[PDB]
Structures are given as C-alpha cells and as structure tokens.
Amino acid sequence: MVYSYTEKKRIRKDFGKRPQVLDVPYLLSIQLDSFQKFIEQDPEGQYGLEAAFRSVFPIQSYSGNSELQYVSYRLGEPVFDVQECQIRGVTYSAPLRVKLRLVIYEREAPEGTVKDIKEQEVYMGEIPLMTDNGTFVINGTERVIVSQLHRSPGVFFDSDKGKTHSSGKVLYNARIIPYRGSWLDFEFDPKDNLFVRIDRRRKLPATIILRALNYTTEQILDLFFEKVIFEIRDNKLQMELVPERLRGETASFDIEANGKVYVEKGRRITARHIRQLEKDDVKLIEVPVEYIAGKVVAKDYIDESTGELICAANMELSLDLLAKLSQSGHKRIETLFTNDLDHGPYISETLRVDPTNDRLSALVEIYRMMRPGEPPTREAAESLFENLFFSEDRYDLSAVGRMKFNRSLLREEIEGSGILSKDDIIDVMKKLIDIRNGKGEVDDIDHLGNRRIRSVGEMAENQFRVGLVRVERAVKERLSLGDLDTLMPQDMINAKPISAAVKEFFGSSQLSQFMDQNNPLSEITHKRRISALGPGGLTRERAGFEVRDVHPTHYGRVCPIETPEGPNIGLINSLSVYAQTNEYGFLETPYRKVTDGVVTDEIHYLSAIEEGNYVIAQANSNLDEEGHFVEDLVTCRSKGESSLFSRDQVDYMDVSTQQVVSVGASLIPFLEHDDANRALMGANMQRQAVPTLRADKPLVGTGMERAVAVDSGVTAVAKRGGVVQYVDASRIVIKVNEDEMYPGEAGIDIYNLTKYTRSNQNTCINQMPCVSLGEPVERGDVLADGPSTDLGELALGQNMRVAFMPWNGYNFEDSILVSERVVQEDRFTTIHIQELACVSRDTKLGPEEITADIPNVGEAALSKLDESGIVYIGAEVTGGDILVGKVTPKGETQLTPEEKLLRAIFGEKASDVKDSSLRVPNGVSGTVIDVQVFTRDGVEKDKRALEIEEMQLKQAKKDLSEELQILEAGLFSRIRAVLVAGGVEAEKLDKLPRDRWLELGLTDEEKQNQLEQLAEQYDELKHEFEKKLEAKRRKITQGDDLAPGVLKIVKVYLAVKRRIQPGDKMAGRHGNKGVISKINPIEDMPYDENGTPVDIVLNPLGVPSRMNIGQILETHLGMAAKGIGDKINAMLKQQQEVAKLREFIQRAYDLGADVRQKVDLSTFSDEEVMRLAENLRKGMPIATPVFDGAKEAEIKELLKLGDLPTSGQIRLYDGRTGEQFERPVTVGYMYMLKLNHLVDDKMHARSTGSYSLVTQQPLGGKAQFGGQRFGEMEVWALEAYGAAYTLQEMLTVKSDDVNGRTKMYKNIVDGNHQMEPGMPESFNVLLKEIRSLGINIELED
Amino acid sequence: VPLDGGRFATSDLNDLYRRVINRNNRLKRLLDLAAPDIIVRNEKRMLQEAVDALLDNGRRGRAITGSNKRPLKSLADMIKGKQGRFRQNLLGKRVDYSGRSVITVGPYLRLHQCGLPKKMALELFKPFIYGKLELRGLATTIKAAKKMVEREEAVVWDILDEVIREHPVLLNRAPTLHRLGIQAFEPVLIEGKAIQLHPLVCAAYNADFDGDQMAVHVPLTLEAQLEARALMMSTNNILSPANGEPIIVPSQDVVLGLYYMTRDCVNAKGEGMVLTGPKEAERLYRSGLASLHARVKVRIT
Amino acid sequence: ERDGLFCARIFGPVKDYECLCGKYKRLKHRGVICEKCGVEVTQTKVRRER
Amino acid sequence: DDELPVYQGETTQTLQDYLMWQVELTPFTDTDRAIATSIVDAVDDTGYLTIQIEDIVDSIGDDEIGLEEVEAVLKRIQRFDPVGVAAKDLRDCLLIQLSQFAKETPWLEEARLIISDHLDLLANHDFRTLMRVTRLKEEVLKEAVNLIQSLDXXXXXXXXXXXXXXXXXXXXXXXXXXXXXXXXXXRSNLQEARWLIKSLESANDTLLRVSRCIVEQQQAFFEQGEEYMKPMVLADIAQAVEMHESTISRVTTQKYLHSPRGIXXXXXXXXXXXXXXXXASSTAIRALVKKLIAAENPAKPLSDSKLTSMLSEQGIMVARRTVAKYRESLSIPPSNQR
C-alpha cells in the first residue's frame, strides 16, 4: 500500500492473521460530536442552544398583550488563541449574541399591535468553546468534561426479589422516570394491594390518582376489568359462556348446554370438554343459583320506581338483593369476571381501602398529603393536580422518555407529547397488573438498553436552560407594570444568571475535572470515560454490588478489563474501541452483515436491545476466500448466552477482535496469556507512567500506537502537505503543494512547536521535529513528537534487557534490581517543571512595589536578581534564594529622637516596608527556565518588563515577515516576468531594486497595468501587513483584565531533572510492579558468553502465582526482536551492499504464517531502504495485535533467523565469581515503565513543628509537616505488648501535652530522657464541650 | 475561620449561638412589651427550635442552612470527628518525631536491624544531636547548634552515628492488624531515600515491595527505649501469639534455595565418594562435584 | 464587640498581658481591671477556659 | 468538628514566642528565668525597644534583686538569635551587633567602637568635624561607616506577618471622561426560613445599587480631576437619599471604594466647610502645605512663618499658628531645623 512517508521510516512487522474491515475510529470523537451538536443552528429547534431558546420563548408576561421573541444566536470570534489563553490564565470562550424581536401592543385592542422594535444583538454571557483535542481551557487549565451514564427516562418494573416479607413473594413495582419532574411508583402490599407513591411518599390508595382523572367508579371498574354479562328473567338465569376465559374451576352442578349436559358435576375441566362445547355452537345457558353468591356487582343498579340506596359498586350480592333486582324488572346484569388463576381481584380491594371515590376528596387528599400540614383549600388540589404532571413545562420526560415509554407499553407511534396523560398512566397500571398476572416479565436495570450516556452537549444545555429560566422569571417583570421605557432587549435581559450558571458548570462540578496530562494515553482515556457518578445519580457507598458487575451487554460497548481498582470499581468505565453512541443516547457497536453464509462487508451498528434478537458470531473464527465459514458449527451469541449454531443461522460477525477491549488494554501485547485481573492492573499502570528524556518506541506492541499518538493530539500533524521549507527546534513551515491552496491567500503553513511546559501533573511537554528538511510531506504525516512519542508511536517507557532469576535476595518479593548502566545512560531520567507566582497589590496602607532593594537583606542574597528584581533567566535556585522581592509599607512612623536617628543613619532604608518576597519553597531546586510578568495598564512598568514585549514582538514580526517575503518574491517574479517582453535590462534590473522606480513608463499597457497592479498590490500588502503589525503592537503594549486589589503580576518556572534511585516504582504492561531495591555496578551483573550484562534482573517467582504470561512471551519475542536488529546492526557496520541488506530485511518482514502484512521492497529503491534499515538498526519493531497475536511457533521461527536459541534461555555467568549459573536463564528485552510515584515526593520525617490551635496536635501532612497518625489499632498493638510508657509518651508528651512537650524537649537537649507527663489538651476540650450541654463532668479527687 | 482576603467569616457553631441569641432577644423584647399570647407563643416555639437545634441538628427534620446547607454541626456532632472520641483523642493522636518512606529489601542486615535513610534521621534525632553538640563543646549556645545542623556539615554526620547507636526505633505499617504489625529495631544509617526492611519480617507486616510505605517512630525517654528492646524488637517475638507456631518462617526465594541444595539426583559426577568433615565446601566450590547428587557418604558429629 | 460572642471582659483579653483600653499594658500587675472594661489580664490562654 | 481541615489554627511563632523558646533552653536559675520572662514580654515586634529598665527592676517588687542582676541577664537575653535583640536606644544595639565582628575585621573593630559607642549623635548629618575628633581621614572612616550602615536594625526577621492584609476592593470606579463612573464590581420551619432568604436575596441585588448610587452622588459632590477633593459635608449625602449621617459614614467606613487613585473611601466624604468666604478644606491645606514645604529652604531656612505668609498670599486666611501647626506635623522637618 506504499504506506505513507513517516510510516516508511520504521514499519512494524504484523503478526495478525484476521484481515481488518472497519478502520478504528476517531477515538476522541465522542467529545466533539457532542459539543459540535450543542453549538449549531438547527431548523427543528432541538439539539443545543436553539432548544433552550425555544424552551421559553416567547414570553407572555402578565396579560400584557406585548411579548418578546428571539431569532437564532450566532457567535463572536474568541479574543485569544488557545495558547495565549492558556498562558494568561484566562478562560477560553466566546461571546453569545442574540437578536430578540420586541412586540408592543395596545391594551383593550384585540390582536392589534402598536409597534415592534429589536436590538441588533443582545450580548448574553460567554459560552466556553472546545479545543480540537477535546478539552475546554478554563482559567489556563485543560479540564476534560466526563461523560455520564445514567438511568434512562421511561417506564420501569421491579420484582423486589421478595427479600422483604420473609415469607417470600413477587412484589411488582413500577416507576415512571421523566427527564425532569416528579416520580410515580406503584407498588404491591404484602396483602396484595396497589399503592401510589409520589416522589418517595408514604403509600396512598391506588384509585385516588385515577380518581383525579374524572372517572367514576363505574368507569373505573368497567375500564380496568372485563365486561362479560349475566341475565335472569323469570328465574331463567341464563349467563353468557366464557370457556376461553377460564383454564379451570370446580363445577358444583351439571352444566346442560342446549338440552344436553356438556360437563357433569365433578367432570373433567380439561380441554376435551372445552373444545367439545367449543366446536358445538352454544348460546347462553342456565346455571345453579349458588354460583352467583360469590360474584360481585359491577355497574350501579337501581329500580325503575326507586333509585335509592343500596348496591352502588364493590359489594358482594346477597339473597336479599335477588328479590329486589328480580322485582325491578332488569333483564341484563353486567358483573365482574374475577376467576383467579392468572387474573386477580386487585384494584377492587384498593376501592375497599379508598376512603372516598369522589374526585374532589382525592385531590384534597393528595394536596394535603404532599406537604405534611395543609388546610383543605381546594385551590392547592387544582394547582398540584394539573401542575405536577400535565403542565407544558413542569414535568417533561422528553424524547428518550417518550420513545422508551412507547416501546415499554408496546405502542406503535414513537412520537408524542413530553407530558403524561390519563391513558398513559392507566396503561402503566394495566401493564403493572399484567406482570402480576404472570404474563410479562421484569426489566434488568443493569442492561445497557436501560442506561443512557450524556456528554458535555447535553449537560451544558441543561444548565443553560436553567440559567435561562431564572432570567425569564425576571424579564417577565419588565412588562408587569414595569411600564414602557422602550429599548427592551438591552436593559431587560441580565446576562449574569446565564453566565454564572454556565461558568459555574464548567468551573465546578463533579464531571468537570482537571485533565490527566502525564502520557498521551492518560489524556485519551480520560476524555473516553463513562462515569456513573455525579448530578444524575449513583451516590456511591449506597450503590450496591450489582452495578459493579459486568453485564453481558457491555460486550462491545464498555470494557470489562479497564476499571479503577480502588473502592470505585466497576463504577467508572471506559468505552470500548469501536463503540459509538446514538441520537438517543444509547451505546451501539458494529457488526458485519451476513446474508446466506457469506459475510458481506456492510456493517451495522446494533444497540443492546436490537442485538439480542439476532445471532452474532465470534470475533475470531475461521473463514474462506468466498466468505463461507470453514467449520459447520460456529460459536455464537444469541441472548444472554453463547453456544454453537449452524452456518445458516448466524447473520452477523464481530468485525475485529479488539471489540471487547478498551483502548487502554488494546495496547498490551499478549493480553490473552494474562489473567484478567492482573491485565486489569497493568492497563491502569500504563496511565500513570511518566515520559522520560528520550522516547524509545516499544519493541513489541499491538499496532495501536500510531492511532493513539496522532489522535491524542499531542503530536504536531501536518495539514495540507508538501515540501518542508524551514526547520528548527521551535518552528516548522511547510510550503504547500500548488494543488491544495485557497486562491489569493497563497502562502505557506507555519507550526510553532511548544517547548518546555508544565503539565497539570507538573511533568514536561515538549515537541521535537520528526521531519528533516527538503522532504515531502502529505496530509496526516506527523511533523513533531509530543512527549512520550517516537515518530508517531506512543512510547511510554523504555526497553531493558531483563534476566529472570533470583539474585542474592535483592529481588525479593516484588522488587527489582537494575544495572548502574541504566542510571548512567539516563533512560528513566524525567523532567519536572514547577510553577511559582508573585503578585503585587494595593493594601489599606498604600501600594506595593517590587524590588531593586529590600530592608535588612544582604548583597549575597540579591546577587541573583536583576535591576527590576526578578531572577535572571538561567539562574540556579535553591533553598530560600529570592525569586522576586517586594515591599509592604506599615503605618506612620513619625518622631522622637530614636526614630529620627535611624532614619538619619541608614536613610530610613525605605522605612515602613517589610521583607515580603517570593523566596523558593524550602526543599525545592532547579533552574529558572522562564519568567512571565503580566503588568497593569498605566503603571509605567519600564525596567525589564519590556523584554518579553520586544521578544514576542520580534517573534510576531519574524513570523509575519515570511508571508511578505514569499508574496513579495511572487510580485517580484511577476514584475521580473513582465519586463522581459520589452525594455529588458537583464542584470541591471536585478541590481536596481524597488521597481527601478517603475523603470520609467515602458509601454503604455505596461505603464497603466504594470504600475497600477504592482503599486496597488504593493501598497495594499505593505499597508495591510504594517496594519497587522500595528494592531498586534497595540495588543502587545497594554495590561490584562484584573482584580481591583492587584497591581502587577509575576510568575517564575523551574525545572529539575529527576534521576532514578531505589524508590522507582517501576512496572511493565503486564501488571508487574516493584521498587528499585539496589543499583549494581556493571561488573557485578550476570552476563552472557559475549560479556553483555543484563540491564535489569527480576524474580521468576512473580510469574506462576500471578498467572500473567504476557510477561514471558513478551521477553522471548523481545529477544527475537533485538536479534534481527543486531544482524542489521552488524551488517551496516561492516559496510555491506544495499542489495544484501534489502534481502535480509525483506526476508525478515515476510516470515510467519498468514500475518496479512504484505510489505515488500523493490517498490521503494536505493535509499528509503537504507533509511529504514538505519532506523531499525536498534531493533526491529514487531507488532502483535490483541487477540490475533503471534503464536509461540512464530516466535521460535523468528527467533531462529537471529541465530538465538529456540528455548529463549541462554547460559549466563556470574559477575563476581565469574562462574556459570547451573541451569539456563530467560534473557529478553521487556519494555518498562516508570510510574508517577517517586520517593522524592514521599520521604517525610518531622521532629517538632507547628500545631493546631484547638487540640494542639501536630498538623496533617507533609508540606505542613504532618506527624504521622498513631491511630486506634496502633494503640491496641502497643497495649497488647504491654508497653505502656511508649504508649504514654505517644498520647501525651509528643502530641497534645503542651507543658510536657516542652519539658520533654528541654530534658532531651540536656540528656535527661525523663518524661514528666501531663494531661492532653484534647481531654480538656472535651470537658468544655460536654459542659456546653447541661451536664457537668468534673474530675473528682 | 479567617479568610483569603481578610474579613473573617463565621464558623459553623457560631451560627447556632447567633441564632439563639436573636430569638432570645426578640422573645424578651416581645415579652417585656406585654403583647398577645399568639406571637410570643410562636416565639417560645421558635426559641425551643433554636436551642434544640444548637444542641443536636437531628431530632426532627431539615436543620441546616442556605449556605449549601448540610446539617451544619452542633455540639453533639462536635464530639471527636467520627462521633466516637476516635479522632483527636482515643488512640488517635496524630503524632511527633515520626516520618514515613517507601520500603526496599534488607538482604544483608540481621534480624534486629533496619536500614534507616540517612537524610531522614538527622531530623528525627534533632534534639538528641543538639545535646551532643553542646556536650562536646562544638556549640556554646542553642542557636549555634541549630545553625550547624541547618548547615549540615562535617561533625554532625559523625555525631549522628554516635546518637543512633543502640537507640531502638520502631516501624509500623498500614492496617495494623495484630500486635506484630509494629516492631522495633536497631537502625543502621544508609544513604538513600527509602527504608530497608529485613526479609524475614515481611511476613508479619504483610508487606511486599510494590510501593508499600512504613511509618517510623522514635521512642524517647528510657522507659520507652527499654520497652522497645525487651518487648517490640523483632528478635523477641518469632512466634505468632495466636496459633503459637513460628512467624519468621523463610519464604519465597529462601525456600527455593534450600530446596535446591538438598535433593537427590541420579549420576551427577563425583558420586559415591567418601569424605569426612565434610566439610564438602571444598568440593562443591572447586567443581570436583555437584551438590544435587552423588549421594555421598559423609561422617558427621 | 462588647457583650457579644468573642468579647473581651468575659472570655478574657486578646493580646497576652496587653489589654484593650490601652492601660496597665504589661506585667506591672499579675491581675488588674481597666476602668473602661473588665479586662483581667494574667495571660491569654484564657480564651480556652472561660 | 473533625476529620476535615477546619480553621483550627496554625500556631505560628512571633518574636516574643521565639525568644521565650530560647529562654527555655538556657541555664537560667529560678529567679533569672523570672527576670528573663519579665524582659522578653517587654520586647516589641520592632526589636530594639525594651522600654524602661528601672520599671523592669521595680516591677519585681524589691526584696533585694538589684539592678545589676537584671542588667547581666538582660545582656545575655540581648545576645539570643536575631543577633542584636532588645537592648535600648539603638546605640547598645549596634554595640551588641558589633560585639561579634570576629575581631578579624581590619580597621573596623576600634573605629567602630568609637563611632558606635559615643559621638554617633553627630554622625547623622555627615562626618565633618567628627573627622577632626577621631583624627581619621579619607576612606579609613568611610569604610567603618560602610560597616555601620551595613548592620540593619534590631529584629523584624522573625516577623511572622505573612498576611499582607489586602483590600479586596468593594466598588469599582471605571474612569470616564476625566472623572469616575460607578459599576460596583466583585421541613416547614426552615421553609419559612427560606422566605427570609427571599428578602435577603432581594436586598442583595440592591446592595450593589446602594454602592453605585452613593458612589454616583459622591462623584458628583467632589471633583475628581481637582487637587485633593472638593470640600463636602455628610449633609449632602444625607440630603440625596435622606439617610442618617452615621449610617452613611458606617457604610463608607466598612466598605472600601476602589478608584483609579486611592484604595481611602471614608476620607472622600470627610471635609471641613472652612468657615471663610474666600474659599480644599484641610486636605489641600495640609497636603499642599507639605507640598510647598517639600521644595523650599535652599540651605536651612526652617521658617514656618514664611510658609504661613505664602499660604496667606493664596487667600486662605492663615492664622500663622494653625497653618504652621498642621504644616509642621506628620514628620515635617519644618520649624524643627531652626
């Protein structure tokens, strides 16, 4: 495929057998597409700002006849760039402006409108935009906003699993969940009665909520039950037959159907006697009277003459009633069915418990029920009733709620209003009873069908709607008798609630957090994370153990391996590779479509509900050129299960094997051989690695590294490419091809790389150019590498020659011994940049000034400062050297001889000023890499504040001058081209610049055309470019927006290189971790017969118990990987011909079964091959994808080509004794990391420090110098030893005994070592705090 | 609870006192006014609510505030953090002359000892050092001493050794489950930032070396030092005071080495030699033989 | 503020043996009380007892 | 409560705390520790001042205990960490700070003892006649004086005042057309308490309106561009909104207005009416009085009567006493040099 360019600098070798279909996606995409849909104009109105405008507008005021409306929004352009904005510490956002039409109408005049007026735009707030990479810069910090996965709106059902009543039942409760509004949850009693809860309220009867619907009891029972019939005329007593309505009963008498007995008394009820009466046509028949005594009347029945009193409803009929209804002359009687097998007599007992079935009594009952105390006002009832659900905006379940509400009840229409209705709640009660009847099951809450993701679009839209309603309840007051000032869309709108709400969200919020900036892969995995926590749900500690577990629908949606191992476990998950999300917020995952038994290359994204209906094959399975499965029985998934099916049954297939695994784990070689928990650690550990000075490409890897690097957006990637004009460390320009260009802009593309820059985790970000010079580049090729990147691959650690074997106990337990070589060669050396800021501000006593000079301070200390008082760039600073000095004046020192004497002798030395300065924190170190110094407008800063002014100005002028040199070169090419036609002076034209003063008039055509175009374009480009330089110049000389109580601002950056020591906390991809126990000299290590010592020695005994065998296979293939590079090393070092080198690399790439990577040489020729070979001199980078990876067999094969022993073990020699170890040993390259845990950050130690005002105990932690909690278990252990003195000095003397700490330390200094214990403060306190209740507690002698 | 810019803000417990005082003054004002029983009645109600809210913010509902709310805290809640006296007192003082670092292995360094990082003592032992300095006469005054250990040159490291000698330290780890979880040792100064812990005790501590961290504490006095020697030193207790059976038991590569040393093997040169003493060291170190084998007949006392 | 939470008089002084009202400033007296206020000197650890 | 970082405290150390710590650790007797504790409280955040000695001696209530006992002890206390501590008068401060020069300082020991011990009162102005007193000449004396000027004063190294006590402003005055325009920057029971909040939330919106209002009237009362501020009375602000004087002065006393010059909020409403037909109250009188006294006295005129005549020439009706008294105050050398 000829690849592209940088890829041809090093090609990894692929061992993956299965071909790929769907390319891995954008990864980040889930952030962008969210917020890209939140900022859009939409005609339909939903999806982003439009929805919050339409959520309110238009506003009606109060019977005003005048209103207000709005039209779109639009935007502004952001004032600062992302880098500027990040430096200055300003939040990165943009103006939101909206045109609101105002309509003013006359009173008492219907439909008449007197006038209308609208402001061009009103400016409301600034919405923060999003960078290209997925972060919102906010007060010069990145901050990723985390996606959340919440219980979806719609109708839900629950069995309770009968773990309450201790008898056991099935208690079926249904909750309705809106998008915003109240919750309705119907439940069952132990006695089997439905109850209504509203917002977790004590249970109410069932038929009150239904009684609010203007339904009489007749309509209640007739609507919620069967009709059937019963008829008795002159004691004929013929009832309608319902054989299909009953599956059983006990017959008390012989049932005769049309002069023939169908079923005798006690005869079989089985389907024989049923179908026997079915096939035969039978009308209404007579039954025994005693059977009716159990039936209950349905409709209200009254005599024709008198309609008084008895038998309204829900009354078991009596023998007294038969005479009355029979004498009344009613032929037909409609009664309830109620035969109990599936069916049940519910909702009738609810009527029995219901105190009154009247509407008004129910509304008053609920109205008085909501708030505990309430008068029966009757208005609360009408208000809350319509309000709590049927209001336009009060309760809204929205589109997910409505859709899933439709599919939950099996409605055909998927569209509807966002508010409930009578038939809605009635149908919910119908389905609820239906679940009790045995027909229908429950829903799994864990199912991903029932769990939806919200991303930053949807959440920002929420808070923006909130913020907008809080404005509208105010703006409603302008037309409220606020009368008329006209000019409405200017003073009426207050932007403060909108802005404070939006920047309140992004600022502070559980789901906006500081981004993990160590690693690219940390960045990535932060920005695709799905949290269950937050605003929308899962308070944790109370969540329970079931949302922790992997459910079978997480199949290629979340990940089963990447999860925090800490006490939020299964809570915070990570998107799987190829996962995406719907318009409805549900996780869907791709599959190849299989028609007949051939696999079509069309892919379909299936949602978790859609997925279970079908059959889906296995990621890794066989296949043919034709596309038929090799094996006739293929392992597949159906529904919650897996098993073998026939060839013709399965319609889908998994695309790639990467589907189950997340990107984090998609990086780990040999992940099969690893146990899942141990895999689970190592996936987490590659995040907390730390990029080192030189980035080594991993020598064995999955193939995934190109994506992550270039997606993470830490690399500099070339747009619209072409040949490289200019190169350098900080800057890289590309002269683009003539093909891709916008006409009239012309020009080239420039890239300014970012040099050393703190990250949120105080680590370096550094870009270093990959490309050379005079080299062609296409779009997508990487120009620079960010930190922990090599030529577009993700390189988080280093490769190390590992030997497995115990070595003198130094590698014991999980520790780890390393050759001094490693420390000399500086792999694992990592930079750290730390920020410190000084700010100079106005006090009550007057302004504060920075430096030159200070009271009571030596010249010694001041030697590293400048004329202006900031430290010279370049200084080495340690300990409490003064980084910026500053003076704070005190009050009014006047007179008396001593004051006048000190002012006379020393010149007062600026007198009242104090020593307040920016001294370095004690125990910190490092050179000063950069100083910023933001100032105030009109302070007249002068001094050295201007050096950054001139510096940035020269950089800007130099960057703009390039386009003027190239465009002026083009104009000079046109002028030089036109002068050739006539009046050509040749060299004389070149030696005479500035048009040769137009070179007279030449021809009239060249006069007007050449002088007009040349002078016009020349003066327009000169004046326009100078105008850009004047605008930028005005942007440079100014001062920032700033607090009223701050005058000028200075910040200093420091850098330290930190060198590995025996506190390293090194790890590997395979869940391997340790410390560095010791650094050995080089001669003390084990070495092979050629004298090459292993770098780093690790303890075999790790490996069986933990069952992570990725480690071992990694080593072996690593071994074999170096081997090839050793062949080539040795080959190029002997000055071999290009042809033979080509032959051995070609012969290397093509080894293995299958392996799908067809690269071959002869396509690229002469150099290009020498290039790569020199690029792979240090090892050949073999790449084994996740579950299609390299087999042992292929590893031994690869390894025999390197003249290495097939077993991967080798004889090694002791380094001290020179003696061979008995038994061979595995040696191999394994690829290590250094984790962000360093002991420099850990070792604390205090003796005596500052205490706490109350309780008078030492302070909490390091940095503040804690002392070290000695907690209750630790006391228990001493008591258990019976050592009561040690315990007694802990408790007292060395924590809260104040007099006794002093006496203690004074005796120690004197050599007494005696205690003199007293009474600890904190007891005294307690006695006061109990005296603060009316209890005395006193100590009695 | 003083603020960032000045202008102190009121604490949580103060609000309750302010409130009670407001209702007390208002009930007193309306009480001395001779007004109707309704409004002073509602003031009696309001003040019982107020005092009952200052003694416990529970008892009934809501309590809190419009501050972001939360129950606030009261004098009941004020009882020692966990509403036990856990915190602050009761086994739980936070503490002095202490520090903490990462653990590495100790693979020389006998049982009763403990690699203590050089830099880290020098702090822990400060008072002790100044004493010695004033004895030798290197500092006449406390400020002098202080300054020389601040400058940390020369004599001071020499005196540190003299200070540490035989002074038992005690290490402690993490969940302390049983009494073994804290033990006492003779330190040996070692340049480094980490603490070296002898292998054999890793059992007790339940510690591997994957980034576990230990606290260290300094007994002062005499009594305490002796209680450390004659109770918590790791050489007193080798047996687990539950089951009674030894802890200290060798694990992990010690086992693998003994098990390798003592085996039988078939052949493996120098088989069936007869030697006495043995010592037999001669012969393994010299080649001459293979320790796995030979099924050598040797004479033994 | 006088007769308030926090107040001098009851609850003691603010600076150690220096007291409000600017009189009998230090150590001239083990106890004493000003004429402006009831300030009783003696140390200021008494904010932890009174 | 606990388990959180409540603002329990820091327990920082001042100078007296540290000195007392230093006394704890030194070989004082039972009595001498009482004298030491007696002196360290007498010390100030400024160092040097140990106030009156004979009150230190007499404060102990006789019974023996001479002056010499407090004197020796006093010296030893004067010797603790910040070098020169306490003592008195700065002279003995520089003698104690000069006590340790290591004695290996060339020319400095002797000369420094002569200059610092005695005659240092005349070293204020310059050398001059002192050069003839000690017989020294050229740079021999100038280098010693370089050392004396290199000493610093007392303590104020312990300090423990990291708190700058910032202003935080209150209301911002955005400068308009050579003036200022205000903007003002920067279950059922508790439900009834919720209602009070509604009133507090309604008053919170008007809180900025009071600052912008009183600020606008304050800008209209005094000209910004003019020297100092135009004289105004609280009766003007009390005339505008009809509020009581003490209330307005209390709002301006608590809150502090930030303008482009001055942080200075309650001083913009306090002025005198001068009680004269020919005429910025005391602000420009004392301010411009010290400004006119700034450039004057070519050598040593030290004449406040001439300044009073210059003030009378401006039409302010100077009393030659009041004007001179207010002008000569606040560190003003006027009339002192005569």
Numbering used by the authors:
A (entry chain C): 1 to 1341
B (entry chain D): 253 to 553
C (entry chain D): 52 to 101
D (entry chain M): 106 to 257, 259 to 292, 320 to 396, 398 to 413, 415 to 473
Quoted from the paper:
Our cryoelectron microscopy (cryo-EM) reconstruction of RPo at 3.4 Å shows that most of the RNAP has clear density for side chains. DNA is visible with a clear trace for the T and NT strands. The DNA strands are first separated from around −11 with the NT strand draping over the σ54 ELH toward the β subunit. Interestingly, the ELH appears longer compared to that in RPip with density for residues up to 324 although is still short of the fully extended ELH. The transcription bubble contains 13 nt (−11 to +2) of single-stranded DNA (ssDNA) with dsDNA downstream of +3. The NT strand follows a path that is lined with positively charged residues, whereas the T strand goes through a tunnel formed by β (residues 538–543), β′ coiled-coil loop (residues 318–323) and σ54 RII.3 (residues 107–112). The downstream ss-dsDNA junction is very similar to those observed in σ70 RPo with +2 NT base inserted into a hydrophobic pocket formed by β subunit and +1 NT base forms hydrophobic-base interactions with W183 of β subunit (Zhang et al., 2012). It is noteworthy that, despite the structural and functional differences between σ54 and σ70, the transcription bubble architecture remains the same, opening at −11 at the upstream edge while returning to dsDNA at +3. However the DNA path as well as the ways the transcription bubble are stabilized at the upstream edge are different, with σ70 using conserved Trp residues to stabilize the flipped out −11 NT base, while σ54 uses its ELH to physically separate the two strands (Bae et al., 2015, Feklistov and Darst, 2011, Zhang et al., 2012). Upon loading deep into the RNAP channel as observed in RPo and RPitc, the RNAP clamp closes down, returning to a conformation similar to that of RPc.
